[PDB]
């Protein structure tokens, strides 16, 4: 992929103001609540019975944080995303057997979470810079297929 200069600036800037823990937790909690079938891959997390339980589950918060920290790694090597996520592609695909359409859903939720944490600072051009990021990361993960 080709990363325009503004895009990098837009991606990097915003990223530095991101609360990895609160956002990661919220993004993953929403995934599970809005698209319930995703709960299937997290049985080892314990109680996900109600949304209030998913919201409080210590491991959801704990995992959400790791997921967003992972995006950070992509934000540090925009030109090297394919490799940064090679091992994760094996885990999601070969180990867990997640369908790539779900990688797309999480990225879309992340975008909505970011939008709610930055308000107007999240300009249309910014949204577009992030959609793109969210996309390439999703392909980078679904590499280990076709």
């Amino acid at each position: 992929v080709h990363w325009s200069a503004e895009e990098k600036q837009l991606i990097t800037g915003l990223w530095g103001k991101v609360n990895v823990a609160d956002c990661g937790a919220e993004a993953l909690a929403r995934l599970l609540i809005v698209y319930p079938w995703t709960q299937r891959f997290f049985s080892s997390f314990g109680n996900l019975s109600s949304p209030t339980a998913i919201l409080g589950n210590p491991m959801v918060r704990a995992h959400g944080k790791k997921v967003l920290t992972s995006f950070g790694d992509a934000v540090k090597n925009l030109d090297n995303i394919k490799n940064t996520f090679a091992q994760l592609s094996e885990l999601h695909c070969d180990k867990l057997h997640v369908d790539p359409e779900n990688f797309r859903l999480l990225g879309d939720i992340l975008i909505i979470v970011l939008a709610a944490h930055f308000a107007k600072e999240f300009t249309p051009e910014c949204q577009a810079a992030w959609q793109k990021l969210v996309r390439v990361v999703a392909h980078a993960l679904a590499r280990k297929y076709h």
Partner: protein, 141 residues
């Protein structure tokens, strides 16, 4: 489908929007054209640059239809059957674009009303947008 609970959430978030509906309809269209460029293909006759009196004029129309499907959430299919032919038959809009518009509308209400778009409400709103999307592409399946 749309649970009595879901219907409540949708109406709730639509009442906190109320007057701004129109402004939100234009912002959603602007983000769509910016984040999903391929959608500009359907508006070759529009001035697609930010601000255009057309994008605003249209954004009003889109928002109005939403506000009107919300008042008939018990029968969204009938309160929009007219728009189905336009979208599915004449325009032949690829079904995917509907997901895009919906996603941009959420990004909007989330920028203006974060504390209202709670994960439980998000879930409802997304079901509601999917319904509309379905009804408007109905002449396909």
């Amino acid at each position: 489908v749309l649970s009595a609970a879901d219907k409540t959430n949708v109406k709730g978030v639509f009442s906190k929007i109320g007057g701004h509906a129109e402004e939100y309809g234009a912002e959603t269209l602007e983000r769509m054209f910016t984040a999903y460029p391929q959608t500009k293909t359907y508006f070759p006759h529009f001035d697609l640059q930010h601000g255009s009196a057309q994008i605003k004029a249209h954004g009003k129309k889109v928002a109005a239809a939403l506000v009107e499907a919300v008042n008939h959430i018990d029968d969204i299919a009938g309160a929009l059957s007219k728009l189905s032919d336009l979208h599915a038959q004449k325009l032949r809009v690829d079904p995917v674009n509907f997901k895009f518009l919906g996603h941009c509308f959420l990004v909007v209400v989330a920028i203006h009303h974060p504390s209202a778009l709670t994960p439980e409400v998000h879930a409802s709103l997304d079901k509601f947008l999917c319904a509309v999307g379905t009804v408007l592409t109905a002449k396909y399946r």
